[PDB]
Amino acid sequence: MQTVNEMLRRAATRAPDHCALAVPARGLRLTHAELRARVEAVAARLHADGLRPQQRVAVVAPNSADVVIAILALHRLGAVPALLNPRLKSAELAELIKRGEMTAAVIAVGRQVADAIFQSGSGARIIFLGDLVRDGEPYSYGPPIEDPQREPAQPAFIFYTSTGLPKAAIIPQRAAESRVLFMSTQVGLRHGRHNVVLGLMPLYHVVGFFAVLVAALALDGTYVVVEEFRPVDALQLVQQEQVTSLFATPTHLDALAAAAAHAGSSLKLDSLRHVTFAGATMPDAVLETVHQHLPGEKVNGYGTTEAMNSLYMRQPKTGTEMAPGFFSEVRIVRIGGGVDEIVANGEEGELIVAASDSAFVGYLNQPQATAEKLQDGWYRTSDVAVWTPEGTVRILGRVDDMIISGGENIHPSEIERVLGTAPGVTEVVVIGLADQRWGQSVTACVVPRLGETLSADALDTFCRSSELADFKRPKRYFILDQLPKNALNKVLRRQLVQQV
Amino acid sequence: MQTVNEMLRRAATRAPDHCALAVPARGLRLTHAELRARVEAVAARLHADGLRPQQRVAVVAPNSADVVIAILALHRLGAVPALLNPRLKSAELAELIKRGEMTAAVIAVGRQVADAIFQSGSGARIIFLGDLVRDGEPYSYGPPIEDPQREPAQPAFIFYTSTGLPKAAIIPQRAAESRVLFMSTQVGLRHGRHNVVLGLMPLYHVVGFFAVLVAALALDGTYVVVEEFRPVDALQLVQQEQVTSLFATPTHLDALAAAAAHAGSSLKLDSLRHVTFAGATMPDAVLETVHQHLPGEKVNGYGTTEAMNSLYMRQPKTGTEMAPGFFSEVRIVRIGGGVDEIVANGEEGELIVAASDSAFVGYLNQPQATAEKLQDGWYRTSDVAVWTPEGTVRILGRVDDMIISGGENIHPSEIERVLGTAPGVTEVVVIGLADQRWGQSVTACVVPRLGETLSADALDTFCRSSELADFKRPKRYFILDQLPKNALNKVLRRQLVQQV
């Protein structure tokens, strides 16, 4: 195999004096060589404090040079970093560290979340990030440390997914490579010092970590650190930094396209060759501004924390329609049936992908969840798809959001995309109320633009003019001043239902 | 890991009805699906005849659809294909199969080489290629067969290198992937059905096999079969077939460039994006015509049967100067010293590369050769290199050809490139005679162009005007009507020496 440490280390030997990390704001640059030295020194410093290999350690921090150093230093020691979204509720992070049986937690959130841990229960050493690394500068003690043996199926890193409370997906050693290389086979990145990769994706997301951070370094390139996203600022980075590739969320891309469109030839974005994104949920409108207004080849990708990348499209026409590339094997089976029950072609079903090398090896301490998800060699996405006559896979929506109304499959995502273009709608979620006509009644929950009124009549009329087939039209509307959302801004479908 | 079988099989599921193999002459095309079916059927047919997994089987045949089918069918059964240059002497092939303890030999050479085996000694079943597959059509019996378990370090394929009698390098299961993917990280190939790969490299060479055949299929592309190389014909294939990438020997590239230059816009070569080659030995003159006259990005690569790819250059200025890319780790140590004795920067030494995943695991039944070559984690190239101030590696020549004259390192390849431009020289080899001034005397052996005379005086004078430093100039000349060469056209340096 080739592990993360080994990928980064080989790079450092090929390009020791080349720029590895930049923070244009803060004015900090480290070569690959210098980043070894800092990773090494931390690794042994933590080692000198008791931490041994295979012990899980939490990392709760916004993107920064210092967290890149800390995460890699932990991998280099042999520890298993558990990367956690810093926007989670204090209570939730503590629960996931207790459930996690974790030896330490590296934190750069504030004093009040360190308190949450102080109580909480689980004896996990609370390490302040700035007690390890500040502005790329470690405080290091002890001799340098040995490189532990790593085994292909051995746990390497822990990323979190998301009913209630995110699950800790275990990423084995053997998975790093194809979690990086798919950026090359699918997206088109090649090895080389021209590589300048803008880090807009958070590091607690596998894409932000393997596909953006590790890729950048392992291709002997430069990771440009982005502590805080701002659309015009970010475009200045592309120009100033010679960014060659960018992997962004749909929301970022909307922002960047809108700025690019109101910069004009003002910004030189010529250096940028790859605009990548997971756009299954990307509305047609946003995608379009992306082709009109941003440069470089656009690639749409579908992936999961559990299996990384499973489908893609060069130069996408719509964001839902993709096709498997290198490393992947995929199938559409009957919902709730065995992994061998393929569908008739054109019937809807569950997207399952083969659980090859890139696959997670289970959820930490949730072997029931695991057995719902890894079956007879496959990984079950929980997403609904259909095969297009065109030979491509069309992702329709989550199995869990699917509305079954009078023996018929309805996907709220479709209906939400139409309704979201109705004038006066700022936000919409479609749920299936419990439930008649029967089984389930298609219902729309909509939030008006500031100061505007909506009426059920006018939205209905709008829907009537849309392309939706009869049965897909909402049977009811609730105009709300807002939708209840979690810590990470996801809509609480289970809960909204109750409230209506 | 991802094995060859598994790479090809996944492809077949992604692109079942896409063209896998073409033979434009012969008018034959097989989709990926159809190629599974034929690989499957052979595999079980051989299986039904006694052949079980891990048993070595010889393959002696010029490039053709049928040998692609046969080699893959053997891998699919579990057998270990030993691929052998068909231009070897009857006697030599037999010796390598006896030494090989091989269970069968698949042959498409003539009746007289089958005789060589008939005698020879080793009880190895002589299978005629056309007894398995003719024009993509198998004669198959028995039920389909089980897919054997394959293990990362387990032998997978056997390729031959070349003093006397080629060594059988064992290629483990785990090596296929990065032997393919380096075409993507270094050369720039991406996954996709646009991929149309011209097979000019012989299949008994690892590049011809992993980097060209397996790459083409595994990227869901098309391998264009070339039974017999002809420069204009081959350029017609690029145009007619929409060839996107081409990996060629230096001799092929000279031929193709010269034809391209005397076609002109006559041939549309636009579809061709990658012209790849191993050009360490490529004269400056030929490389230049390649940039002037052929399209697509040109990439120079350095590799070995033992470790595959170890250095490269996009848009090369000279063919000797390269730099390591993804998967590689390299060092220049003192000649004949330990793998840790790096050289002072600017001093010449032996190029060693790390023996990672892509590495062979030893020479079949030659554990002394193996221990000369795999040391303390490294693979020893037997090539001399130097680090350029520019941060690149300059390959100077084979350790074995190096001439040591009065305590000074002389590389005949350098002196041969100069002398080969002297007017009237058709062919030149520089050796070091035994040996004074001392140690060794630099001597040139030259063959005149048809009907021309050479004299030692005139060549000397030519050399005097060249860039060569004093000590590099030949001290003697022997004008010969030809050089003694082996079966595979390599010059017999040991032997020439005797004759002079």
Ligand SMILES: O=C(O)c1cccc(Cl)c1
């Ligand atoms: O979480 C995602 O959307 C994701 C995860 C891995 C790979 C890709 Cl393309 C997308």
Ligand SMILES: O=C(O)c1cccc(Cl)c1
């Ligand atoms: O044998 C060669 O020249 C060779 C073998 C493997 C890879 C490459 Cl780039 C070259």
